[PDB]
Design a protein around this ligand. Structure first.
Ligand SMILES: Cc1cn([C@H]2CC[C@@H](COP(=O)(O)OP(=O)(O)OP(=O)(O)O)O2)c(=O)[nH]c1=O
Ligand SMILES: [Mg+2]
Ligand code: NA
Length: 319
DNA sequence: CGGCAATACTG
DNA sequence: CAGTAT
DNA sequence: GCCG
């Protein structure tokens, strides 16, 4: 991890992000990652360009941090950024909402609470603003999973529950708990969703709903007892036939998925949480114009294999 | 020049 | 649809 | 921002 010009770049990328410059922020994220994967501290401008993800623009800046020890660009970052970052850390609020609030004169969570127009979701976010920024100890993620699993298996022992996301990637802490559910039957997943949620509300485990779709649930839970914070909980239910892909998707990491999906595209294939497809027809702009065929994928290894990739353990997918 | 993953919910 | 979220 |  020899890299600490990135600290200065992190700031820039994060500023570009809150400000809405999606793609410029992506560029940075790539480079800011590359530099962290580079064994040897970067010495020369040419050594910079040599790394995938770093071009001339980025190189020049990496050079200014070596010679000057500072970064001129950081000096001229708008004063709105900290405020925008503050607002866009409200669940249900992104760059568009954050910028509007700022343009309307709001500067603090206090301003937001008393004067801002909040959606149902955002009101819930503000209400847990501090909790939603905290990562839980891995061991708490476990209890949460077991709580859901136990409640799901209650009215159907056949059901299958798996904690994915950072948890399955074996991370020490977890932003939220990502619980994937399916059934070997491939038909019992039918609407059991509702019964499970209602049940978890009863015991007071689920405190708030943010999203309730046919197959996706985003909510807020809390385990009983003292010293418990509110934790974000995500649950998806999927047909058994889509299990492998769902698992692969819901495990991540995000950058891993985007990478794997970009690779699939180059091969005229397509990857979603539903399936790996082939014979996928696309126009000039990368958009889909032809569906193609679904490829059989009983396990995650099938996906890797079908893409001509060596299998990778969840822990290895962590970017 | 122009894509940078692909999907689900909300209102 | 635009915005936000995984 | 980077890259084909
Ligand atoms: C955000 C995002 C996520 N995914 C997938 C892959 C990961 C899981 C879990 O999402 P999460 O934010 O909890 O990330 P997680 O790995 O669980 O790390 P945390 O402990 O939650 O911060 O969803 C994706 O395909 N595209 C995206 O933009
Ligand atoms: Mg998580
Ligand atoms: Na947010």
């Amino acid at each position: 991890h020899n890299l600490h010009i990135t600290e200065k770049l992190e700031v820039l990328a994060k500023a570009y992000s809150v400000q809405g410059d999606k793609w410029r922020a992506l560029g940075y994220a790539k480079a800011i990652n590359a530099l962290k994967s580079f064994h040897k501290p970067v010495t020369s401008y040419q050594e910079a360009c040599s790394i995938p993800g770093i071009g001339k623009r980025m190189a020049e800046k990496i050079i200014e941090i070596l010679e000057s020890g500072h970064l001129r660009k950081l000096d001229h970052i708008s004063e709105s950024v900290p405020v925008l970052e503050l607002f866009s850390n409200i669940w249900g609020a992104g760059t568009k909402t954050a910028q509007m609030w700022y343009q309307q004169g709001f500067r603090s969570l206090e301003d937001i609470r008393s004067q801002a127009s909040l959606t149902t979701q955002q009101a819930i976010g503000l209400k847990h603003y501090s909790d939603f920024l905290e990562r839980m100890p891995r061991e708490e993620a476990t209890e949460i999973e077991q709580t859901v699993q136990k409640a799901a298996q209650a009215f159907n022992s056949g059901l299958l529950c798996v904690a994915c996301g950072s948890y399955r990637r074996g991370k020490a802490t977890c932003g939220d708990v990502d619980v994937l559910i399916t059934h070997p039957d491939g038909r019992s997943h039918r609407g059991i969703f509702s019964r499970l949620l209602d049940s978890l509300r009863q015991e007071g485990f689920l405190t708030d709903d943010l999203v309730k779709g046919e197959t996706k649930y985003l909510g807020v839970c809390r385990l009983p007892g003292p010293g418990r914070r509110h934790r974000r909980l995500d649950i998806i239910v999927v047909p058994y036939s889509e299990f492998a892909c769902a698992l692969l998707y819901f495990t991540g990491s995000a950058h891993f998925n985007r990478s794997m999906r970009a690779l699939a595209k180059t091969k005229g294939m397509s990857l979603s949480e539903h399936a790996l497809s082939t014979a996928v027809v696309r126009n000039t702009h990368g958009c889909k114009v032809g569906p193609g065929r679904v490829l059989p994928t009983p396990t995650e290894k099938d996906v890797f294999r079908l893409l001509g990739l060596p299998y990778r353990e969840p822990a290895e997918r962590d970017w």
